[PDB]
User: Which sequence fits this backbone?
């Protein structure tokens, strides 16, 4: 099966979600040696803001697209197709300013596509990604889970994933990381424990 | 007083939030002819993703910054200073894929600055923008207000604004815009009514 490994942290080697997302994937490889991993670092290779140009490019035939529109169209196509081909997705999702990084949301904007990841039915709109397994690696300085302050982070992500039909979702959480090295260490230790004995 | 008028819609002339945000501001001008308006179209002039480079640039002295770092540093400085100088802010905030546009979040990333719009106290973190009045122009295809699906949109915005200490907040809402021209018309009519007789 195909595992899509997504990171969105801007903290490089000091990143919590990058460490944990890699550990999830390594554990996954161990449990299933046949898994084929595809990596996308949304911070190192940032996806352009979903723009008016993104919309225009989509509604313009290839033969008449200019260079900028070919860029947008290809960016949209390769991101979407990469996601569609994935059977499992591990997503590094830090909380920056009470929500996900724009680098991650820009990716969401490219994978939320009518007729592909969800569809509008005379009955309403249904997700088409029910076969995909998602492991969300959620990291935050404070402790916001289950509180109103967590709305733009995990609550939002659960909403979007639910919309495109994800039912098989696990959340590997390491929060309260801002509260000092001991709280940070335990938060990560607990996340690692979850990975080792509660995922596979 | 200084009114900062922010738009983030990518729909140009077909934009609901652009129409309503302009109408809020025009009404404000009418009620207070001395108001000085500053406009920033976050879609037309998109702010770069808050990146590792944004962080590095901040921690590098001007005399040793390269061109890219001067760009990031200036972008951070001019956005923040523009917000700090504003006494009132009108914000156009569409829901794109269950949250705000990345164009708007990228702006949030530049105005959320420790020691400037909030601060960390031995007692915890307090907003410093209590003197600013905010009018949020909230537009959405569906009806999500007060529902879990609204978490990444209005709930998130209320969280962020609260964090930086905004207490004087009004929300001009036009939702259910996807439900056809009649529902769309009334939603906007009601928003206009609010503007005309419930703001000033």
Assistant:
């Amino acid at each position: 099966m195909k595992l899509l490994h997504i990171d969105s942290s801007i903290l490089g080697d000091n990143s919590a979600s990058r460490q944990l997302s890699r550990e999830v994937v390594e554990a996954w490889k161990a449990a299933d040696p046949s898994v084929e991993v595809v990596y996308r670092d949304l911070a190192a290779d940032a996806i352009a803001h979903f723009s008016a140009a993104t919309l225009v490019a989509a509604g313009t035939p290839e033969d008449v697209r200019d260079a900028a529109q070919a860029f947008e169209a290809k960016l949209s196509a390769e991101t979407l197709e990469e996601f569609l081909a994935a059977d499992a997705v591990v997503i590094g999702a830090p909380m920056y300013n009470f929500t996900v990084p724009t680098q991650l949301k820009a990716w969401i904007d490219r994978v939320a596509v009518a007729g592909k990841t969800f569809r509008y039915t005379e009955a309403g709109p249904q997700g088409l990604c029910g076969n995909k397994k998602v492991v969300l690696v959620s990291t935050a300085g404070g402790l916001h889970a289950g509180q109103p302050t967590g709305a733009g982070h995990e609550d939002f992500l659960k909403v979007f994933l639910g919309f495109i039909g994800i039912t098989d979702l696990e959340i590997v959480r390491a929060h309260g990381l801002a509260y000092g090295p001991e709280q940070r260490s335990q938060a990560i230790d607990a996340a690692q424990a979850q990975i080792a004995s509660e995922l596979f």
